[PDB]
Design a protein around this motif. Structure first.
Motif, PDB file in Angstrom:
ATOM      1  N   UNK A  86       0.846  -1.187   0.000  1.00  0.00           N
ATOM      2  CA  UNK A  86       0.000   0.000   0.000  1.00  0.00           C
ATOM      3  C   UNK A  86       0.881   1.236   0.000  1.00  0.00           C
ATOM      4  N   UNK A  87       0.529   2.208  -0.846  1.00  0.00           N
ATOM      5  CA  UNK A  87       1.120   3.540  -0.824  1.00  0.00           C
ATOM      6  C   UNK A  87      -0.002   4.537  -0.568  1.00  0.00           C
ATOM      7  N   UNK A  88       0.233   5.495   0.330  1.00  0.00           N
ATOM      8  CA  UNK A  88      -0.805   6.476   0.633  1.00  0.00           C
ATOM      9  C   UNK A  88      -0.183   7.694   1.299  1.00  0.00           C
ATOM     10  N   UNK A  89      -0.897   8.818   1.226  1.00  0.00           N
ATOM     11  CA  UNK A  89      -0.447  10.080   1.803  1.00  0.00           C
ATOM     12  C   UNK A  89      -1.352  10.510   2.952  1.00  0.00           C
ATOM     13  N   UNK A  90      -0.733  10.933   4.051  1.00  0.00           N
ATOM     14  CA  UNK A  90      -1.405  11.561   5.182  1.00  0.00           C
ATOM     15  C   UNK A  90      -1.162  13.060   5.088  1.00  0.00           C
ATOM     16  N   UNK A  91      -2.196  13.849   5.381  1.00  0.00           N
ATOM     17  CA  UNK A  91      -2.112  15.308   5.382  1.00  0.00           C
ATOM     18  C   UNK A  91      -2.117  15.786   6.829  1.00  0.00           C
ATOM     19  N   UNK A  92      -0.936  16.113   7.360  1.00  0.00           N
ATOM     20  CA  UNK A  92      -0.799  16.533   8.752  1.00  0.00           C
ATOM     21  C   UNK A  92      -1.077  18.026   8.890  1.00  0.00           C
ATOM     22  N   UNK A  93      -1.783  18.409   9.950  1.00  0.00           N
ATOM     23  CA  UNK A  93      -2.100  19.817  10.184  1.00  0.00           C
ATOM     24  C   UNK A  93      -0.979  20.500  10.960  1.00  0.00           C
ATOM     25  N   UNK A  94      -0.432  21.594  10.381  1.00  0.00           N
ATOM     26  CA  UNK A  94       0.620  22.403  10.990  1.00  0.00           C
ATOM     27  C   UNK A  94      -0.032  23.544  11.773  1.00  0.00           C
ATOM     28  N   UNK A  95       0.639  24.012  12.829  1.00  0.00           N
ATOM     29  CA  UNK A  95      -0.002  24.961  13.736  1.00  0.00           C
ATOM     30  C   UNK A  95      -0.198  26.354  13.135  1.00  0.00           C
ATOM     31  N   UNK A  96       0.314  26.624  11.935  1.00  0.00           N
ATOM     32  CA  UNK A  96       0.004  27.879  11.253  1.00  0.00           C
ATOM     33  C   UNK A  96      -1.176  27.753  10.298  1.00  0.00           C
ATOM     34  N   UNK A  97      -1.769  26.575  10.192  1.00  0.00           N
ATOM     35  CA  UNK A  97      -2.838  26.349   9.252  1.00  0.00           C
ATOM     36  C   UNK A  97      -2.416  25.634   7.991  1.00  0.00           C
ATOM     37  N   UNK A  98      -1.117  25.497   7.746  1.00  0.00           N
ATOM     38  CA  UNK A  98      -0.681  24.788   6.558  1.00  0.00           C
ATOM     39  C   UNK A  98      -0.828  23.280   6.758  1.00  0.00           C
ATOM     40  N   UNK A  99      -0.491  22.552   5.702  1.00  0.00           N
ATOM     41  CA  UNK A  99      -0.568  21.099   5.648  1.00  0.00           C
ATOM     42  C   UNK A  99       0.807  20.565   5.282  1.00  0.00           C
ATOM     43  N   UNK A 100       1.231  19.507   5.967  1.00  0.00           N
ATOM     44  CA  UNK A 100       2.471  18.818   5.629  1.00  0.00           C
ATOM     45  C   UNK A 100       2.159  17.380   5.236  1.00  0.00           C
ATOM     46  N   UNK A 101       2.596  16.977   4.045  1.00  0.00           N
ATOM     47  CA  UNK A 101       2.330  15.623   3.575  1.00  0.00           C
ATOM     48  C   UNK A 101       3.313  14.625   4.183  1.00  0.00           C
ATOM     49  N   UNK A 102       2.804  13.437   4.506  1.00  0.00           N
ATOM     50  CA  UNK A 102       3.612  12.307   4.955  1.00  0.00           C
ATOM     51  C   UNK A 102       3.306  11.136   4.027  1.00  0.00           C
ATOM     52  N   UNK A 103       4.270  10.779   3.180  1.00  0.00           N
ATOM     53  CA  UNK A 103       4.065   9.797   2.117  1.00  0.00           C
ATOM     54  C   UNK A 103       4.492   8.417   2.615  1.00  0.00           C
ATOM     55  N   UNK A 104       3.537   7.483   2.710  1.00  0.00           N
ATOM     56  CA  UNK A 104       3.761   6.151   3.276  1.00  0.00           C
ATOM     57  C   UNK A 104       3.911   5.102   2.171  1.00  0.00           C
ATOM     58  N   UNK A 105       5.013   4.341   2.219  1.00  0.00           N
ATOM     59  CA  UNK A 105       5.210   3.117   1.440  1.00  0.00           C
ATOM     60  C   UNK A 105       5.133   1.944   2.414  1.00  0.00           C
ATOM     61  N   UNK A 106       4.219   0.989   2.179  1.00  0.00           N
ATOM     62  CA  UNK A 106       4.003  -0.107   3.122  1.00  0.00           C
ATOM     63  C   UNK A 106       4.028  -1.473   2.437  1.00  0.00           C
ATOM     64  N   UNK A 107       4.625  -2.465   3.101  1.00  0.00           N
ATOM     65  CA  UNK A 107       4.518  -3.854   2.662  1.00  0.00           C
ATOM     66  C   UNK A 107       4.289  -4.755   3.872  1.00  0.00           C
ATOM     67  N   UNK A 108       3.464  -5.795   3.698  1.00  0.00           N
ATOM     68  CA  UNK A 108       3.200  -6.791   4.733  1.00  0.00           C
ATOM     69  C   UNK A 108       3.453  -8.196   4.190  1.00  0.00           C
ATOM     70  N   UNK A 109       4.104  -9.043   4.994  1.00  0.00           N
ATOM     71  CA  UNK A 109       4.387 -10.435   4.624  1.00  0.00           C
ATOM     72  C   UNK A 109       4.069 -11.353   5.799  1.00  0.00           C
TER      73      UNK A 109
END
Length: 227
Positions: free
Chosen positions: A159-182
């Motif tokens: 799975x690949x997906x992006x989280x949009x984190x809220x910054x204390x000035x109102x902006x958004x910071x992306x966190x890009x996740x690469x995931x594998x499960x076995x």
């Protein structure tokens, strides 16, 4: 799957993470319970080494997708419960926009009657003046969706997906996740058709807790496969 039978009721959960971000070591311990019938998880986490050196919202995705609610008509596509009780390895890279990255390796399995998530996290190349080491993120997590695909060569999922984190000035910071499960064991597992997981998270505080901590209510539900 026979693994699914282990989740028809309320299951105790333990989470144990050892981390090192830019050389700053820390540990987190969490305990709670999961109710896969309702896709519901309730947890309390404590930083057992003092002050957490990163914001709690950045650790939520790292700190048990076997508790997702898969609707009855999608039960043949639930990889996470099918690997139980022997469990699975979950690995990620999480890249923070204009900042450093996390690399995580976890094992999720039953230990006795308790579902245990044991994680090693390394954080590399963070800015001491950035939003993570500088604690400039809001104490919340927006809802998000993630696409799950099968990886038949590795007998697991990706799975690949992006989280949009809220910054204390109102902006958004992306966190890009690469995931594998076995899977950890050799038994049969369910390899799914492509589908989605939808997550909602509520973060709160315990008014009687003096340690650095997070109270978490999380819902995860699957969708996107038609008969």
């Amino acid at each position: 799957s026979k693994g699914e039978e282990l989740f028809t009721g309320v299951v105790p959960i333990l989470v144990e993470l050892d981390g090192d971000v830019n050389g700053h070591k820390f540990s987190v311990r969490g305990e709670g319970e999961g109710d896969a019938t309702n896709g519901k998880l309730t947890m309390k986490f404590i930083c057992t080494t003092g002050k957490l050196p990163v914001p709690w919202p950045t650790l939520v995705t790292t700190l048990v997708l076997c508790f997702a609610r898969y609707p009855d008509h999608m039960k043949q596509h639930d990889f996470f419960k099918s690997a139980m009780p022997e469990g699975y390895v979950q690995e990620r890279t999480i890249s923070f926009e204009d900042d450093g990255y996390y690399k995580t390796r976890a094992e999720v399995k039953f230990e006795g009657d308790t579902l245990v998530n044991r994680i090693e996290l390394k954080g590399i190349d963070f800015k001491e003046d950035g939003n993570i080491l500088g604690h400039k993120l809001e104490y919340n997590l927006n809802s998000h969706n993630a696409y799950i695909t099968a990886d038949k060569q590795k007998n697991g999922i990706r799975s690949n997906f992006k989280i949009r984190l809220n910054v204390e000035d109102g902006s958004v910071q992306l966190a890009d996740h690469y995931q594998q499960n076995t899977p950890i064991g050799d038994g049969p597992v369910l390899l799914p058709d492509n589908h989605y997981l939808s997550t909602q998270n509520k973060l709160s505080k315990d008014p009687n807790e003096k340690r650095d901590h997070m109270v978490l209510l999380e819902f995860v539900t699957a969708s996107g496969i038609t008969l």
